Structure 1
Amino acid sequence: VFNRPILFDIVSRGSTADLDGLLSFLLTHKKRLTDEEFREPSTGKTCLPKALLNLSNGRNDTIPVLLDIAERTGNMREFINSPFRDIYYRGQTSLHIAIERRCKHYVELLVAQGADVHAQARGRFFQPKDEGGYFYFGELPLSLAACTNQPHIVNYLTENPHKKADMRRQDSRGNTVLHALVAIADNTRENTKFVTKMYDLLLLKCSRLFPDSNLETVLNNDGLSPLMMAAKTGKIGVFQHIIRREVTDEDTRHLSRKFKDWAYGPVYSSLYDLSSLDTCGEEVSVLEILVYNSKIENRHEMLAVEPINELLRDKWRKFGAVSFYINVVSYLCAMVIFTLTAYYQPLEGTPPYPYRTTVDYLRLAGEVITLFTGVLFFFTSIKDFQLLYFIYSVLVVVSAALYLAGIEAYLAVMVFALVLGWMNALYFTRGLKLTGTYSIMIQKILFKDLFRFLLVYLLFMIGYASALVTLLNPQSNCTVPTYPACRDSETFSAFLLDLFKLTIGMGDLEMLSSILLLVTYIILTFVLLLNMLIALMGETVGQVSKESKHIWKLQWATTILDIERSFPVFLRKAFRSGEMVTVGRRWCFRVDEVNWS
């Protein structure tokens, strides 16, 4: 009419008398309700979305007049489809605003007049919290209604006489409504309950509309599908449900999981349909994602959902423990045949090719077994406790190469590879006896503590040599652990370095008699190192907390799955199958639970 601000103020106030006649002025002035000057150049906001976000308790009756002007001006469809060109927002057509406002009164007329129900809200503000946004819902009006708790809006949009939003349609991320509805889910009570309810509603509706394929199958750009996405993101409330979903009516029962097999009074055989909790190495599986992935925040309970835990139990029973025990036997054997080939190292010096006699031939047999296992380990580490394992393999390879070169004092990284292989055998010791927490504590220790102690110890060595050179300098023939400066007494630090190491490495010392500063300084390092050590023991014991049960369960599962991934699982060693047709073959896992209902 005259300027955009007055239009915005009028629509916010909701006055209709002033708007009257202005439409005639626009028509006579050759103006369109979608013209740029009517829309803010930054956000592209139009009068209609402004009214739709200024609801006076959901009774701003001006918007119908605006739509009337819109089709009168000749441009209505694009007027309803008013994408925001800014970066903070985007898309955000009238439908998103109306649906989000928890008001279906305007949504009905907005859709009926004709509004794109496939508008992509592809803006920064709509991305997940991590990717720079604030609210992620699926970038679609239907997924917006479902996520933002507007089931009535969903029912109207999916079954309106006008255009309907197909559920299978997926946003740029390839989500579909189910993926997004999983995304917003948390581990709370009300949110989880509502999300599972809407999930069941939406899945049933899609199945009824298209029984050929349930909506859950559709995979996203990352290729997860709702179940695996819930497993990866750390969801529990939605996860616990989606894995125990059963439906009554046969026409929509096929999409069930927790079938029923039979009952014998107080014993119930629930036939869980774990069709994607293990793929036998063929494809991605929910169990592998749940366990290997480190981003999981609720892995403890998620492992113990029920079918997963009993599936791991069964895997342990058949071809899960025999492999474990033969693995430890083989590894202890291949480490003993390395130990005995290390201590029996070829004699005489210069061992390029000293294998001559029967005992020496047996030593060669042991060495070749070690090298073969080393190269096999290399392949298993690159072809597929993994970095320490690559280190072991490369060290043994270097040792074998140097031995073939017959180079002196270089069969000493071979012994280091041996001792590594002896601390490398802690991979196995994570199952029986609930052992392996030594691995956790030493993992905490590593370089962190090693170089912390080493740097404080160099600190004290250097300060102490400084004390000697600054207090004692005022024929001598030099003292071994560093000495004053003149008389050609430069000496070296390393001697006092090892002296301080072993002396405060548990005594076995001479306590160099050069005093007040020096003795107080030695006392100070006593206190500091005692602190360091017992404090570190304090954190180690304070954590773990009796080694916990989640820990042992997790490493036990990891050992299982590593065992299965070792060999081709698709062979006749897979999880139990079930019913052929009608119910299914839909390989099923049968769990028996006794109840006194």
Structure 2
Amino acid sequence: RDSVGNTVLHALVEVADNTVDNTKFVTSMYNEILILGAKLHPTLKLEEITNRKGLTPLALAASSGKIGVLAYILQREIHEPECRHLSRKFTEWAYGPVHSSLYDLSCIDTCEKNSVLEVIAYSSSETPNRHDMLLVEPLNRLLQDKWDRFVKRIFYFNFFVYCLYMIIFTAAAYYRPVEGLPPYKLKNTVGDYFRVTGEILSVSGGVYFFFRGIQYFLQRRPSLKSLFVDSYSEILFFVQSLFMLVSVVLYFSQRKEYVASMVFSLAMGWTNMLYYTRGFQQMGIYAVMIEKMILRDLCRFMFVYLVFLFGFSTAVVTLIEDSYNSLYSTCLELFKFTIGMGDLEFTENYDFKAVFIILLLAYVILTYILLLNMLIALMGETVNKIAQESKNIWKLQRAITILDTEKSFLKCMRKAFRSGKLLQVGFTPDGKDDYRWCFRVDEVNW
């Protein structure tokens, strides 16, 4: 019996929970069942089962993080006659500590529906072991070789182009004209032509980023609940694009406020450069730490601090009546007290001075010594919590970066395949030959 046409292998992928004994259970069942199916009806491929979502059992295993299934289903190796057309791994050369294994490469690069990499790297950040799933030998070495071969030429080139764009934007912004009421009529001097060119390039960059963000949001379809947990970088780039467009709209509307928009874009224009530090072995950690601290910490501490700030602010402002002249100024003053920059003068001529002093001393003790250092202790725990995972984290930062680039590929090339339509495998119940884009990989393990 089944629910939606699921095969027994499908139900077993669902049931498996990465326990060692359950792993052996499902592994042995898969071995026997696949052998029997190969012998009974060697007429068509059955692993590409359709479904309501079109999900294969290996695709489901990738989606749910059932690493135990992936460890075996992608590593079948057998030579028993009448069932030799379902093997995925082979061997050609062998030595004591080193073996030159031959791996099948289908369902990874070009499956046309949902490859293995296309699900592990695009998971919803609930899978407990997505950082380890890419450590399996075929995927790990494929990503390593794709990185070494051609990807770097595109990544470093992108980084250089972005840096040039930001330098040009900064230069154009610095030299804006001072007289009021835009738009301004250019003179025939060379400086005006350079400034106009800089502005045009800046707006072009802004428009480009806007459309890239639109495409990403339409294709990915975020949930609106995990919108900010993932896809942080696209959100920030898109926000920059919005600010730039608002700035140009105000510019052509004959208002002076466009500068107030522009500088905000300019600030992010530099800051988002930290994105490109992902993918470096060492310097990448200082990006992910900022992301975690700024999302999953301060959105909680915000309310706890704000209660204290607002309560004491209204207390002080209503106590003194006749520099604390308004609610805003007092909010700023107490904020300055919080971070140790403020000063306690105690000038004359306030009535109720003796109570004012007690309130301020209570506030300073409560906020500066007690609460703030509590926040610091929590952040210290957060950063120490991911000192050790840094290697595996970096691997994810590598992998996703590749998958966006090779998907885009920018030159109408088709060099993604590793090597060959190798016919040396050629196993099939028919008399014909076949290939699987096989990859020779040396494993040194003893």
Question: What TM-score bracket applies, with the shorter chain setting the length?
Answer: 0.7 to 0.9
Find the partner of 1:293 among 99, 119, 123.
Answer: 123
The reply to whether residue 403 of structure 1 matches residue 251 of structure 2 is: yes
RMSD of aligned residue pairs (Cα, Å): 2.6
**Partner-residue secondary structure (3-state), 1:319:** helix
Map 1:99-114 → 2, pairs under 5 A: none
Give the distance between the partners of 1:511 and 1:180, measured in 2 at CA: 73
Give the distance between the partners of 1:508 and 1:362, measured in 2 at CA: 45
Deviation at 1:431, TM superposition (A): 1.2
Give the distance between the partners of 2:12 and 2:284, measured in 1 at CA: 40
Answer yes or no: is the 8 Å Cα contact 1:461–1:500 preserved in 2.
Answer: no
Give the distance between the partners of 1:291 and 1:538, measured in 2 at CA: 29
Give the distance between the partners of 1:373 and 1:549, measured in 2 at CA: 34
Give the distance between the partners of 1:439 and 1:595, measured in 2 at CA: 34
Find the partner of 1:255 among 80, 86, 101.
Answer: 86
2:190 paired residue number: 358
2:338 paired residue number: 504
Give the distance between the partners of 1:225 and 1:570, measured in 2 at CA: 29
Give the distance between the partners of 2:258 and 2:153, measured in 1 at CA: 39
Segment of structure 1 superposing worse, 334-343 or 352-361: 352-361
Give the distance between the partners of 1:223 and 1:569, measured in 2 at CA: 31
Map 1:10-29 → 2, pairs under 5 A: none
Answer yes or no: is the 8 Å Cα contact 1:203–1:215 preserved in 2.
Answer: no
1:427-486 superposed Cα distances (whole Å, 9 cap, x missing partner): 21111143333333332333651683476256335424423533x45xxxx6x323xxxx
1:203 paired residue number: 34
Find the partner of 1:341 among 163, 172, 176.
Answer: 172
The reply to whether residue 372 of structure 1 matches residue 204 of structure 2 is: yes
**Partner-residue secondary structure (3-state), 2:151:** coil
Deviation at 1:304, TM superposition (A): 0.8
1:481 paired residue number: 324
1:146-195 superposed Cα distances (whole Å, 9 cap, x missing partner): xxxxxxxxxxxxxxxxxxxxxxxxx4423212211211112111111110
Q: What TM-score do you get using the length of structure 2 for normalisation?
A: 0.84
**Partner-residue secondary structure (3-state), 2:180:** coil
Answer yes or no: is the 8 Å Cα contact 2:183–2:251 preserved in 1.
Answer: yes
Give the distance between the partners of 1:351 and 1:510, measured in 2 at CA: 46
Give the distance between the partners of 1:573 and 1:421, measured in 2 at CA: 33
2:409 paired residue number: 567
Instruction: For 2:435, give the aligned amino acid.
Output: R
Answer yes or no: is the 8 Å Cα contact 1:261–1:270 preserved in 2.
Answer: yes
Segment of structure 1 superposing worse, 407-416 or 303-312: 407-416
- CA gap of 1:521–1:268, structure 2 versus 1, over 3 A, is closer
1:47-72 superposed Cα distances (whole Å, 9 cap, x missing partner): xxxxxxxxxxxxxxxxxxxxxxxxxx
Map 1:261-340 → 2, pairs under 5 A: 261-263=92-94, 267-279=98-110, 282-294=112-124, 295-340=126-171
Deviation at 1:549, TM superposition (A): 1.5
Instruction: For 1:444, give the aligned amino acid.
Output: K
1:515-546 superposed Cα distances (whole Å, 9 cap, x missing partner): 22332322222224432442233232232134
Give the distance between the partners of 1:527 and 1:204, measured in 2 at CA: 69
- CA gap of 1:528–1:464, structure 2 versus 1, over 3 A, is farther
Give the distance between the partners of 1:500 and 1:467, measured in 2 at CA: 10
Deviation at 1:225, TM superposition (A): 1.0
- Provide the identity percentage: 48
1:539 paired residue number: 381
Instruction: For 2:152, give the aligned amino acid.
Output: A
Answer yes or no: is the 8 Å Cα contact 2:340–2:368 preserved in 1.
Answer: no
Answer yes or no: is the 8 Å Cα contact 1:206–1:214 preserved in 2.
Answer: no
Answer yes or no: is the 8 Å Cα contact 2:313–2:334 preserved in 1.
Answer: no
Find the partner of 1:449 among 289, 298, 308.
Answer: 298
Instruction: For 1:421, give the aligned amino acid.
Output: G
Instruction: For 1:460, give the aligned amino acid.
Output: L
Instruction: For 2:443, give the aligned amino acid.
Output: E
**Partner-residue secondary structure (3-state), 1:408:** coil
Deviation at 1:316, TM superposition (A): 0.5
2:224 paired residue number: none
Give the distance between the partners of 2:261 and 2:304, measured in 1 at CA: 25
1:149 paired residue number: none
- CA gap of 1:340–1:569, structure 2 versus 1, over 3 A, is closer
The reply to whether residue 440 of structure 1 matches residue 288 of structure 2 is: yes
Answer yes or no: is the 8 Å Cα contact 2:337–2:364 preserved in 1.
Answer: no
Give the distance between the partners of 1:455 and 1:404, measured in 2 at CA: 43
Instruction: For 1:293, give the aligned amino acid.
Output: S
1:552 paired residue number: 394
1:215 paired residue number: 46
Give the distance between the partners of 2:49 and 2:335, measured in 1 at CA: 63
Answer yes or no: is the 8 Å Cα contact 1:338–1:370 preserved in 2.
Answer: yes
1:382-411 superposed Cα distances (whole Å, 9 cap, x missing partner): 123111121111211111222222321222
The reply to whether residue 586 of structure 1 matches residue 436 of structure 2 is: yes
Deviation at 1:547, TM superposition (A): 5.1
- Comparing both chains, which one has the higher relative contact order based on Cα–Cα distances under 8 Å and sequence gaps of 6 or more? 2
Structure 1 segments of 4 or more deviating over 6 A? none
Give the distance between the partners of 1:518 and 1:463, measured in 2 at CA: 9
Give the distance between the partners of 1:238 and 1:546, measured in 2 at CA: 27
Give the distance between the partners of 1:569 and 1:228, measured in 2 at CA: 29
**Partner-residue secondary structure (3-state), 2:92:** strand
Larger Rg: 1
Give the distance between the partners of 1:252 and 1:360, measured in 2 at CA: 76
Deviation at 1:198, TM superposition (A): 0.9
1:520 paired residue number: 362
Deviation at 1:264, TM superposition (A): 6.0
Answer yes or no: is the 8 Å Cα contact 1:273–1:588 preserved in 2.
Answer: yes
Structure 2 unaligned runs (5+)?
217-232, 348-352, 428-433
Answer yes or no: is the 8 Å Cα contact 2:240–2:268 preserved in 1.
Answer: yes
Query: How many aligned positions are there?
Result: 411
Answer yes or no: is the 8 Å Cα contact 1:460–1:525 preserved in 2.
Answer: no
Deviation at 1:353, TM superposition (A): 3.5
Instruction: For 1:582, give the aligned amino acid.
Output: G
